[PDB]
Structure formats: C-alpha cells, structure tokens
RNA sequence: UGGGUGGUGGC
C-alpha cells in the first residue's frame, strides 16, 4: 500500500510507471480510490532482507 | 474470465434452450452486444480452446505468449469432425425451425462473485431513529433508510414539483412540532398540554 | 537477481527463441521486432517467462494478451471474489465468513502457472456452456 | 401416414427415424421426452444420524440425483394428491440406510447397491437403484471413516421435470431434419465457400445430395427427422418413448375435455 | 382492368448487394425511350439477360384483410408467374416527355419513363404488377 | 427468497378455469383463449396444426413472459366456422396421428427385439 | 448531512435486471419489497370492497 | 445528473427478487447490468402521486432541453435486429408473420397485403415495421445525395407511416434529433411515443428470436490476402515514419506554427500512424462481407464503431499517455527491452498486431498504461465534475 | 471434490464411472481414450468427468475427528 | 438496541 494519503489528485504517482516490469502487477489494482496506489508483489517478487 | 460480467437475467428450463445437433444445450449465454465494443477477443479464444481440449480430452496450455495461434485450434477442431470456427447449427426450442445464423457454442471456465441479491435487497417503512437527531438510521444491518441526497433534491427542483419535496423532508422523516411566542419570536415557550 | 536500480543498466530479449536471430509471412503467428539496430548486441538478460510479469490474481486469466487492459484489471480485481475452497480444514475452523462452492472444476483453459497457486487442486468455479447468441432480449 | 423407422436400438439409447410428420409435432415430442415424464425420486430426506465429512443437504442433493427404477410408476400416484397426510406406504418408497464404518481403519463407500428399499406400494418393482450389470455398486455417495455414523431415512415421491430436474427421465436428445439444407431454412456463415467447410451429417448418407440445376422447391416442407432418446437406466427407451407419447396424449385430451366442458 | 401492357428486353441484372434480390433494367421494344427498372427476387422467379418479359400494371386483380387464397376463386394473375403488390409513392410530371413514375413494392422499387399517352392513366395509389414468362 | 412454486407450471388453481375463452369483438368470428398452466409444448403443436387447414384464417399465440407459465392465443377462422369446433377437430386429428404412431412403434420394437 | 439532504424512509433498494417484455413506464417489483413498503389509500366510498379484502 | 435521473413509473409485481426495467430507459439513467443499485421512493399522499404522474412520468420527459432531442431511444439487440430485419432481401412466410403481428398491442386486426402474391406468398419486413408506426407520419431524409431510385438502399422516405425504402438504422431511430421518435412526439403527443417502443421492441425481439444472431471468432478474421494488404500498408507506414526519422534526424524537417521541433516531430508521428490505422482499418472494413456479423453491428450503430473493427482485426494503433507517445520512463527508453533513443513505433507503444494475433509482451504492457490512463481519468476528474455541478446548482 | 451423478449439461448418470476411470488410468491409458472406452461421446459427459479434481481424500486425511 | 473511529469491496 502507498502513503501519499489521498491529498493530491496527481496522476504522476498513479501511473503504471515503466520500471514495473515484473515487480508489480500491470493488471491488478482495485477499481476507484485505491487505483494507481495499490501494488501487488509480482509472481517473481522477493524481499531483500 | 474476461470481465464480461452481469447478473442472471432469467432462468429457462431445460427444453427451452437452444440446442445443437447432438442434444447439448447450454447453460450460460453472454450477449453478442457485450463483445464488439469491449474488444475482448481472448474470451472467444478461451471458448474455442475449451471445446477442443474437451473433445481431445486434455487441458491445453493457455499460458500466454506462446506460439499457440488460432490456426492449430481451428485445424484440430475441424479434423476431429466439426466446424472450423466454432459454430453449430442450433435451433429454436419452441419450434426447431433452424436458427438462420449458426451459433457459436462451447464450454468456458466460470466463477461466482461474492455478492448476491439476498444481501442487498432492503426496504423500510419506519422504525429505528437515532436519539441525537431523530432522522432514521444509517446502515443495512439496523434496517436503516436511504439518503435522499442533495442531487436528488436538485432534480426534484428541476422538475419543480416541490410538494413532493415537502413530503420527503417533512413527512417521512423527523416531523417535529415546536411553539413560538409572537413577540420575541423565539421557541422558549414552555408547553404543558393537559393543563394547557 | 536485479532490483529496480539495475533495471536501468540491462538489455533484455523476451523469449529464448529471440536470443538467436531467427529466420515467411504466415498470418497465424505473432511478430517480434527485428532488433537490427545493434548488429552485435550484448544481451545480458533474457526473461524466464513473460507470464511471470503478472500478479498472483493476474496469472489466473486465460490469455491476458488478447484483451483491452481495463478488463484485465477488472478480472484480476474480481478473481478475489470467487466462491470456492479457501482452506481444506473448514470442519474445525470457526470463521465469521466462509463459503464452499460445491463442485469445483479445474479449468480447461488452465495455465502453466496455476500449478503454483494450486488452483487446479482447489478451484473456485466450474466449466459451464457458453453460447454467445441473443436469444430473446434477455441478455441485452 | 406417419412412419417409424428404428435404426439402432440398445438399452442405453435409441436412434430412430420418424418420418412424415410436421416439424412442430416432432419437436413437441422432444420437449415432452425431456420434461413431462412422470417418474420417481427422493423427495423428503430425514437424517436419523449423520457424522460425516460431508454436510447434510449436500447428501440430500446428491441422493436427489440418483437414478431409480420407475417402470411400474403410473400405478403410483402423485405426491401432492395422494390421500395421506405425511408419508405412508400408499405413495412412498421409504429408504432407510445406515452403512457405518465399523472398525477404526479405512474407507467406506456407501454405494447405490447398498441402498435398501424398506417399503413401497408393492410388489411393483419401483425404487430400486438402477443397475448396469448386477455387479454395479455404482453411485458414489459417501466416503466414511472411523465411527462416522451415517443413518439416513429417505422418502421417495413422484415428481416431474417441471418441479425440478432431479426428476429428469432422460439425458440428451439429438434432433435434425433436412441435413442437406434443401429448404434453405438455415444460412451458412462462410469465409470462402459454403460447401467445403461444414462437414456432413451422420444422416448425410441416408439421403442424396442436391443438384445445382434444381430450383428452390418453395412448396416443399421439412419431412424427415432423426432423434436420439437415450436412457438414464430409469426406464427402457421403448417405455420412455411410449409413455412420453402417452403423457402428451393425456395433456392434449385434458385440453379437449376443458373445451368440451366449458362447452 | 390492366392499365399498362408492353414487352421488355432484359439488359442488366444486379445481384450484387443482395443474394435473393436482383435489379433488372428493361428497355422497351414496342416504343423505345420507355425505360423500366424492377427489383426482383431470384428464388421465386429467376431472370436472365436478354430474355422476354410481359409486363402488366393493374389496379384490381378482380376481373378487407388478406387471407391466403382459396382454390374456388380466381384472379387476373392466374396466367402469370411473379405477382407483386406496390404503392404509388411519387409521381413527377417532368420535361417534354420525361415522365417518371415512382411506385414502391414495399422495400422494392419501380421506375418508369416514356410517353404521356401510356402513363396518363396511372395516377393512382395502389398499383400491382404481373410479370408473365 | 421470493421464489414461488414450480408446480405453477401445470396445476390449475381452484376457481380459475383451465381454459378461459374471451371472444374478440374487433373482427367477426375470432376468439382469444387464456390457457392456464402450460408452455410452448402445447402451443406450437397447436399452431402449425391449425395452420394447414383451409377454413382457418388467423391463428397466433404469445407467451407474455417466460417467467410465468401461461400464454394466450388468437383464433380467427373464416366466416362459417365456429373456431372452437375446428380446434376440437384439430385435437381429434392429432391424437389420431399419434395413436397410429404409438401403434406402429410398438410393432416395430416387437420386430427389432 | 441532515437538513438540505438527509436519510429518509419509504425507500427501497436492490440490484436490477433487464426485461424487454414490458412497456416503457413499468418497473418490476419483487414480492417482499411489495410486502414491506406500503401506501396509504384513503378509505372512500368508491374503494371499500377491495380494501376490506386487503385486510382479509 | 440531469432532470430525467428521477423518473416516475408504474408497478408490476414479479417474483424472483430483482428490479425489472425496459431497456429503452437504460440510456437516461445510464445503467448497465453489472450490478447497479436503483432506489425506489414511494409517495405517501394523494398530492405527490399526482405530482409524479403528471410531471416526472417518462412520456413527458422524452425530449431533453440539454440538446432539444429525444434522449430515450433503442438499445443493443432491438436495434441491430431491426436493421437485420428490414434489409431489402428479407422475406418471411405467412405463418410466422401471424405471431409477429399478434405481438403488437396496437394492431387493429388487419394484416397487410403480402408484397408477393405468387408463387408462394411472402412479405418483406419493412411492412411489418410499418405495422407498428401509427398513421400520420412523414419523414424524408436524403443521405449522401441519394436518388428516388435508391441503389445503395440507404436513406429514408416514409409516407403514411409505411416504409417506402431504406435501411432503418441508428441515424434514423437512435437518439438523433429530428429522428423518428422526435417526430412521433411532436405529431402525436406523449402516449403514442410511449407505445412506439413497446411495439418495436416486442416485434423485433420475436423476430430476432426466430432468426437469431450471434458472433464468432471468424467474424474478426479476414482472408489471408487482405491480411497481406494491411500488412503491406502498415509496413509502408513504418517506412514513412522511417522517412520522418531520416529527415528529422538528418535535420530536413519543417516546423509547424506554434510548436517547436519535438512537438512538430511527435505531431507528424501522430498524424502518420493515425493515417496508417485509418487506411488499414478502411481496407479491412471494405473486404468484409455483409452477412458478417460484426460489420452488421457497427453498420447498425447499436454498439461500437469503425475503430473497433480496425483494432480487433487490422491494427490497434499507438498507445498513448496524456495524448502523447510514451515517456521514456527510464533514461532514453520506455522499457529495458529497447535501445536508447529509438523513436520507432514499437518502442513507444504502437501495437502493430491485431488483438487477434497476440501481442508482444511490451505492446501488452503499453496497452496496460492506456487502461491506466482511463482508470485514473474516470476516478479522478469526476471529482471536478461533481464539484462544478454542485456549484452551478447552488 | 467427489464425482457428481449426472452430467451438468445433458443428464447421463456418470458417477459410477469414477472408479472404473481411475482403474483404467492405472494401466497407463490416456484420458480421452479412457472416456472413449466408457462410452462418453458428447463433451457434456466428458467435462463432467475430465475436469474433476478430488478433495474428499484430503478430508479423510483428518485422522479421526471423534 | 449503542456510540465513535478505521479498513476493504460494489456501481
Ligand atoms: Mg456499470
Ligand atoms: Zn416573547
Ligand atoms: Zn398414501
Ligand atoms: Zn454430460
């Protein structure tokens, strides 16, 4: 989840910005208020300790 | 599995379905007009690959970005004794007079979303009002009432029949009766009634 | 391994048939680009598989590469609301919501990725019969 | 005038060739043989004792799908007009079953062959589970383990497919007429050429092709049919056909009587 | 009853847009500059280039809702092969003798030009047609 | 949960007739008949069988909504025929054909065994 | 939130479905919603019989 | 959102608990059937009952003063079906016609005369469409300078309310002002315009039942030759954009009014690939047959358009963000599968493929950014629209 | 879960043909050919057995509840 | 028959 809050309707943090290859999901994000924020870790994600 | 969603519009018993040449009837009939603007051609590709992998009896690799074209699926459906592009000549169930266009027809994987109609039907005569404001309560769980909101009042003004609006915001809500002294104009007037 | 900073400094081809420069005009297949800019590339990385770019509620979808992408987003944000089998111990668990779908079929358009969400061994729907045909105005 | 021509027959299916009736009358036969055949199935289920890995209405549902013998069924009346308040042995086939995995190890498959008729308005051979061979254990109702006491008591009453399709008499009905489209009732969709791509019927070889010089026989009508009335085993296919015609007669005759009684 | 009679030469056939409906353009023999166009059905009455057509326009086939015909009655059409009913929808007195009648057969069309002395009785509302041969 | 009975498909109510006729007085010699508790299975069979007869002029049925097991039919024959009589003869002919059909089918299954 | 617009009663709410076997000014009513909501019709001298039946 | 968004109705009682509608009222409320909620307020007095029944009833709100046109028309199936019905070459036997004219609640009891008498009576469907539309209408339209001889059979002239010729489509009976519905309203009051939708929808549903209509995967396929022509054309377009690159990166390019060098560069790119898409989609439209289903639907206008068939079959075109081609998200490239500073169409998001053939993954992802634009738009600018609309109201 | 009784589409009773299907699978058959031998020829009674995946074994993996 | 916060989902 992403804490910009919702103050700022800005479409630059909501873009599918093109570092996203294999890191988040270009399909999945909810409909509406969450959209552009909520990033599902991909089927090749791993978290570095 | 491509979003072409919606509700069960209607239920037909068994005979009243259309039915192809062997006896197969269908169970779910999405709309032609659901397709051509939504541009979801993958849904057709799934239905076709489904029918083939049913008849040759195994589960076909539909993981994307392979050389699985449409041509292999077409040739296999034909060479296992069928039409190449899916269609079979289906019938009216009320006459059997053949449906003039051939109907496209197969299995596909379906799912069941969590909503139902038995969780969002609600109507309300009266009942629970809040202590604080005596306007009827909010939520489904306490059998609340609906918010006849701002822009509903806007369209009531646009129609103009304000007598309906005086029904809505007086009479099916917190109808309330006060008193005024006509000189200082206020509501300070203490009301005893059986002593009057 | 690479994170998003080394993603800056790499050079990828998508599938391992594109590493060797390949050999036409068949109207079934798909058209990879030529990559004839660098005559002598130094590819450093090639994808294991492209359907590994997806999310978990995205690899379920049969052929995501033939749709209008808002419907991909919709299918991924509806795949979570399936009725099915959530864990196999619903006898002993006591939870405020649980729903078992009766007769769950692994889809005939399985993927190769649904082995790794076990969905062919716990599915959440069925195969019923599609027939895309306006019949009596009820699917308008 | 109308002529019957049986082509195959065995006990799981019949493929006949009804010739020279209208199209509506043949499809009306089809609608009958899915819908209005009075048969017998499990109508109220009362668990005496269950402790299974399966829930209850689950198993009552699956029991409702189970094929019974109803060859003798027309001397059994309908449930909602039989002269008893709740069930007696005039209109029921009471199955009481309790298999029970006694011994604390292993797999117990309550099959169709273990299902016991206890009573029934006998000795009409109704309500037996249908048996492929006689060594047909059959319908996979339950898998029981250690002490899982499953004692069930069913009633069997008589419904049609209109109430619910657990009273389906039969399975799947082919239907076609004019396999070479000599009426042009249908219109092919076609990329290239209509003749090449739509493969011939399984009744193509029972008639001739059309000749290209022939005109559209506008006063011709559809006249030869083919259908396939398979069985669940609950009836035999000849009996299915017979009683479906019989029932359709009876409905038509009741319409006749209401005409003549309003008259 | 018949208010027209002439015999025609089939010059063009346009199947084209329609698999069951074709457009003929018939130029008269007995008096030229009488141009006749009639859209027609193939599979009730196939026609071909350079045949012969007897063309007749009537207003009553006797020699209100349509039932299908009995056997005991008889028509003017009984010596004919392709009988279409129509409606006179546009009547334009044009030039010197450019006299154009537009009568529509319900989705089907019929343009007719030529001398005033033939077409002069045609100013009606419901006009049949009766193709012979 | 407002789900009604599914024996509303064949069982008539008490004071409702199974066969409810009203003659339509727009045109002469036409009738409207309110069938209770059926579907197409009666109706199409009656339609094409009333179609081929000479004296029958107009006959047409509609099922108002398929979530209700009723339908209504229109029946205008020619001038002379009381059309009720024609429909009763239609039932006679249909049962004649089908009883012949059952008869020869019994014979043919006798041979095919 | 409470005076210009508020919540009120004699409402109802559901999910919809198409049905072309209808006029243009008709809307389908599920039976339970017809049971819950009501309408005060005045007992007049031209509607006694049916209203007594609706009591019954 | 507008003064029809509350409309009065009448009560029909049905089991199986959902709300039923007509489908002609789908356009004014803007409701689809993927799960909308619609409320139902009830009057509690006689006064408000008459208020609703005389003002907010649907037949008195047909014509929107927004744009002085009817805003309640025909939707998906009734429309594309009636366009398939009253093509010129459509004939019906008498027997099915009996039922079809039984469905009209306003039919008198008189069949028309069948437009063929012999050798076997048929009809054409335009007279059946004429059974619904009442007596006293005129409508004359000239599309494209047609004649009174009508070769393409488009256009429309109606006298008496019986069709004389013409394929009845959206641009007559849709939402277009001065159409059929508006004319009926002006010439006959509300109630007959109410019964128009009943007559047409019940008729064309019964006929679109007994005909039927479907859509299959072949309908977006053209033959291999037209695929070759589309491929040649779009390849020649990529040659053209190579010429653009050659001259502009050889500094041979002339600058438009008001835009500097990269802006006119990208504007040239946008025009050129749009020309590619338009000519290719035009060829793919031209080849397709007329028994082809998809071309029937777009040529009916009940749903979709030209760019739909172009995108499904021939080319999808350029993926956009904010009108432009795609930003170099990284340095000099808009994925890590590309080289630096390559303004080729496959870099910055031109789908060369159809939908049908499959996308290369990069092209799939760039179309994901298109959907991302659409999502952020539809859930962000509706803030400004709601606030503006509230302020104009108050 | 466990095999249903009829087909979903047509209504031919199939539930008996589960154990026979596994026993035919044990010899190394192929699944289509095994359905071929059982006389399953419409695809309705081919998807009603071909898709089906088995959970009730996992429910009997619970060593005794009582 | 609570309030009051907060989260996720529907159009
Ligand atoms: Mg919506
Ligand atoms: Zn005072
Ligand atoms: Zn009894
Ligand atoms: Zn089956």
Short mmCIF file of C-alpha atoms and ligand atoms in Angstrom, two decimals, chain I residues 7 10 44-45 48, ligand 4:
data_model
loop_
_atom_site.label_atom_id
_atom_site.label_comp_id
_atom_site.label_asym_id
_atom_site.label_seq_id
_atom_site.Cartn_x
_atom_site.Cartn_y
_atom_site.Cartn_z
CA UNK I 7 -23.83 -34.58 -16.36
CA UNK I 10 -27.15 -33.33 -20.56
CA UNK I 44 -21.05 -32.88 -21.75
CA UNK I 45 -20.27 -36.18 -20.14
CA UNK I 48 -18.27 -33.76 -16.16
ZN1 LIG K 4 -22.60 -34.95 -19.98
#
